[PDB]
Design a protein around this nucleic acid. Structure first.
Lengths: 99, 5, 99, 5
DNA sequence: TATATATATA
DNA sequence: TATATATATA
C-alpha cells in the first residue's frame, strides 16, 4: 500500500513544491482570484516561502507539508531555503490573500 | 520575488 | 576517443601540477637520487616554478605542460604563479639536478 | 622552498 | 579572484 | 555514476 498524494488542493494548504533544479521547497497554495485569466487545467498558484516567488504547479509536484516534513524539512544551502523553513512554521500567512 | 520557472 | 595522460614520467619532464586548493601549477618532475629513502609507490618529486616548493604527486595530478598549456597557462594572481609561467618557459632547468 | 603539503 | 563543497540533473 | 551549477571560503 502507498497512499496517493492529493489530486486536489485548496487555498491555504502548506506544501513542499518541486521544480527542476531545486530541492523540494517549503510553499503554500494561493487562491486564484476569479475575474482573472484562468490558469491551465489542474494547476495551482504557488507561493514559495523564503524567496516569495510564485509559480503554477500541478499536484504531481506538490507534497503535503506536515506529511513530508521530516523528508524535505532539512537544512539546505540554497538562497531562501532555510528562510522558507522558518516561514512555513512561524509565519505561513505572509502575503496570503485567500482569507 | 516574481514568477520563477 | 580521449588520449590518456602519462602514467609514468621522467626527470626533467615539464608539467602542470594540481594540488587541492591551488590552480593547476607550472611544474617539473625532479629526479629521485638513488641512495635515498624510497618514495611512496607511483609518486614523483615535483618542483613548482615561481615558489620553488616541492611535493610528491601521482600521475592523476600531473598534466604534460605542452599539451595543457593553454587550458592551464593563463595568468592568475596567486603568489608565484605568474613567475612560474615565466620560469617554465625561460628557465625550466632552475635548480634541476637530474642532468 | 619548502614542502608544499 | 578563484578555489572547494553541495546538490542538483543526466 | 559522473557532470553542471550554486553558494561558501581563502
Amino acid at each position: 500500500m502507498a497512499r496517493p498524494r492529493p489530486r486536489e488542493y485548496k487555498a491555504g494548504d502548506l506544501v513542499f513544491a518541486k521544480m527542476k533544479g531545486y530541492p523540494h521547497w517549503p510553499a503554500r497554495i494561493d487562491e486564484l482570484p476569479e475575474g482573472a485569466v484562468k490558469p491551465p487545467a489542474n494547476k495551482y498558484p504557488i507561493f514559495f516561502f523564503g524567496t516569495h516567488e510564485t509559480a503554477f504547479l500541478g499536484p504531481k509536484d506538490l507534497f503535503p507539508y506536515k506529511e513530508y516534513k521530516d523528508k524535505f524539512g532539512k537544512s539546505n544551502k540554497r538562497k531562501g531555503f532555510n528562510e522558507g523553513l522558518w516561514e512555513i512554521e512561524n509565519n505561513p500567512g505572509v502575503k496570503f490573500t485567500g482569507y | 520575488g516574481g514568477v520563477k520557472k
